[PDB]
Amino acid sequence: FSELLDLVGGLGRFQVLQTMALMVSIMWLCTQSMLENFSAAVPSHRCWAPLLDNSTAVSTSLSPEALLAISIPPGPNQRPHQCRRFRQPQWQLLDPNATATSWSEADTEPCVDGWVYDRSIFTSTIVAKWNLVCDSHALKPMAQSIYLAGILVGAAACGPASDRFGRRLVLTWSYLQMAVMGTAAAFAPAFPVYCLFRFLLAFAVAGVMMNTGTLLMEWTAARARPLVMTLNSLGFSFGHGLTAAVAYGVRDWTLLQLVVSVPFFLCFLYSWWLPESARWLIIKGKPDQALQELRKVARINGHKEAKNLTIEVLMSSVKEEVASAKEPRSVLDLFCVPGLRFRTCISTLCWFAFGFTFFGLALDLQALGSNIFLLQMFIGVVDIPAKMGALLLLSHLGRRPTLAASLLLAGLCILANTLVPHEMGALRSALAVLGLGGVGAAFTCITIYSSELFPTVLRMTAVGLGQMAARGGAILGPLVRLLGVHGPWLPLLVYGTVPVLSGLAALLLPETQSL
Numbered sequence: 001f002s003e004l005l006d007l008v009g010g011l012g013r014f015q016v017l018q019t020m021a022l023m024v025s026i027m028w029l030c031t032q033s034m035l036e037n038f039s040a041a042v043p044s045h046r047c048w049a050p051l052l053d054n055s056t057a058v059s060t061s062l063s064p065e066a067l068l069a070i071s072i073p074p075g076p077n078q079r080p081h082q083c084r085r086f087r088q089p090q091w092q093l094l095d096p097n098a099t100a101t102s103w104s105e106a107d108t109e110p111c112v113d114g115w116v117y118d119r120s121i122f123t124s125t126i127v128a129k130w131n132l133v134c135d136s137h138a139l140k141p142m143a144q145s146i147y148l149a150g151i152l153v154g155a156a157a158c159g160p161a162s163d164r165f166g167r168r169l170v171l172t173w174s175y176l177q178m179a180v181m182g183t184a185a186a187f188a189p190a191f192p193v194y195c196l197f198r199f200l201l202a203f204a205v206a207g208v209m210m211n212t213g214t215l216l217m218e219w220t221a222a223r224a225r226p227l228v229m230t231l232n233s234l235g236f237s238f239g240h241g242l243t244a245a246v247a248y249g250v251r252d253w254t255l256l257q258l259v260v261s262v263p264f265f266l267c268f269l270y271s272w273w274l275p276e277s278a279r280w281l282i283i284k285g286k287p288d289q290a291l292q293e294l295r296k297v298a299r300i301n302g303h304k305e306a307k308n309l310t311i312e313v314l315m316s317s318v319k320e321e322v323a324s325a326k327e328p329r330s331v332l333d334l335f336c337v338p339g340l341r342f343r344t345c346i347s348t349l350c351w352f353a354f355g356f357t358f359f360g361l362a363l364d365l366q367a368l369g370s371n372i373f374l375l376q377m378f379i380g381v382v383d384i385p386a387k388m389g390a391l392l393l394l395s396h397l398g399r400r401p402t403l404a405a406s407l408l409l410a411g412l413c414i415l416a417n418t419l420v421p422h423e424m425g426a427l428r429s430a431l432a433v434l435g436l437g438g439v440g441a442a443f444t445c446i447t448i449y450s451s452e453l454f455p456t457v458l459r460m461t462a463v464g465l466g467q468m469a470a471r472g473g474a475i476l477g478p479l480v481r482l483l484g485v486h487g488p489w490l491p492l493l494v495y496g497t498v499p500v501l502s503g504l505a506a507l508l509l510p511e512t513q514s515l
């Protein structure tokens with residue numbers, strides 16, 4: 001194909017503008033995924049109680065700090081209980097002689113009148129709107145899991161649809177669906193409806209990602225292709241900083257979810273001016289339209305050789321692409337061939353480790369450290385040098401030790417976070433940030449390495465299985481957080497163990513750098 005691109009400008013003004021236009025959309029797309037650190041933050045809470053919250057009653061001579069101790073019992077973390085209140089105010093508990101043995105646990109009752117939430121950091125969040133606390137605590141990670149499951153299902157649908165209807169068309173309607181479903185999720189009347197709209201938003205997020213990457217590749221000359229996928233990878237890195245920047249200014253969840261969605265109407269609008277993939281048009285038998293796209297790109301690049309092209313030139317020069325239809329393959333082929341079972345298992349395990357660990361940890365930063373805004377910023381700031389250093393080491397040391405050391409770095413940082421005492425919030429934050437940096441570096445490695453471990457006809461099927469396995473593991477990410485009831489160290493132990501074991505397994509893969 002690339003000879004046509006060289007006649008048209010294989011890197012130039014058009015590809016520069018296209019890369020910029022698609023990177024901006026990827027930034028906003030990243031914010032959509034990261035939003036529920038802020039849209040679904042858990043403000044500290046207690047039961048509603050008459051002496052504290054019905055100020056219209058007879059006036060109080062005591063201070064709130066005394067009334068709270070008189071009204072809400074102490075909880076396990078030596079702080080006011082989040083799910084119980086005294087059935088009758090415990091005036092006896094104010095005296096200096098008093099003890100916790102002065103009341104029976106049967107003297108408490110659950111929050112019949114509902115909860116009161118701390119408004120000092122966030123004005124509102126879905127947790128506070130629909131009382132996703134106490135017996136309902138499981139509903140937050142369920143919502144996160146439903147979003148990630150939407151991404152899995154949308155990716156499964158995108159492939160067939162993209163090959164039938166074209167890269168640009170599916171990208172266009174994906175942008176529209178993101179705008180519409182995000183706006184709808186901002187105004188959901190009930191929690192089931194919020195879940196439905198977040199699922200349908202995720203369904204489109206998958207389409208945007210896949211077709212962004214594909215439509216960059218099918219318009220970029222090979223000499224510049226590694227660079228462009230590196231830039232596509234940094235779009236998400238800037239998205240993390242953008243999430244921190246927007247969420248710092250917009251403390252109200254409806255307004256936040258609306259503000260990050262509105263941009264996709266603009267993305268939808270300018271996706272109509274992008275040219276459709278010429279490879280796809282020729283493969284599907286429409287060289288007359290492909291000629292129009294090619295001459296359009298040549299005009300954008302200010303070129304002069306555009307006069308030379310005709311549909312016969314296209315059909316003659318793109319034969320090498322047209323021939324690709326003759327050799328179909330399937331996922332079972334990866335496991336039936338005895339020499340490839342081993343590679344497939346270990347590689348898929350690495351993909352799974354990336355997805356599971358990242359969307360396990362990155363979606364509860366409120367638990368990993370002291371300040372969520374700086375945490376969300378720094379998992380973007382550190383992700384950039386992690387990725388660049390990964391590329392350098394992946395060139396100098398080879399694929400095998402770089403992937404192994406990256407995953408082991410991630411795992412050992414996350415596991416160390418179970419040892420560091422709770423008082424050292426700064427160090428706990430730093431170790432979490434470094435762990436997520438290692439996971440990003442490992443993503444950079446496994447993307448490339450999975451493209452080299454396999455023979456050329458199975459290459460695409462193997463990368464497909466890998467990315468689908470990452471999508472699948474991400475669903476289990478949030479659900480494993482429910483183990484925290486047995487101790488906050490246990491989810492960290494799981495999130496840390498998975499990358500360690502997969503990193504050790506990666507040492508068994510063959511090195512694919514030629515020397």
Ligand SMILES: *[C@@H]1O[C@H](CO)[C@@H](O)[C@H](O)[C@H]1NC(C)=O
Nearest residue numbers: 049050054055056057058113
């Ligand atoms: C609040 O106190 C007023 C005092 O007159 C009382 O009439 C009202 O029923 C109380 N409401 C609640 C919810 O306790």
Ligand SMILES: O=C(O)c1cnccn1
Nearest residue numbers: 148151355467470471474
């Ligand atoms: O690893 C992936 O490809 C993934 C998983 N869940 C959500 C987004 N991306």
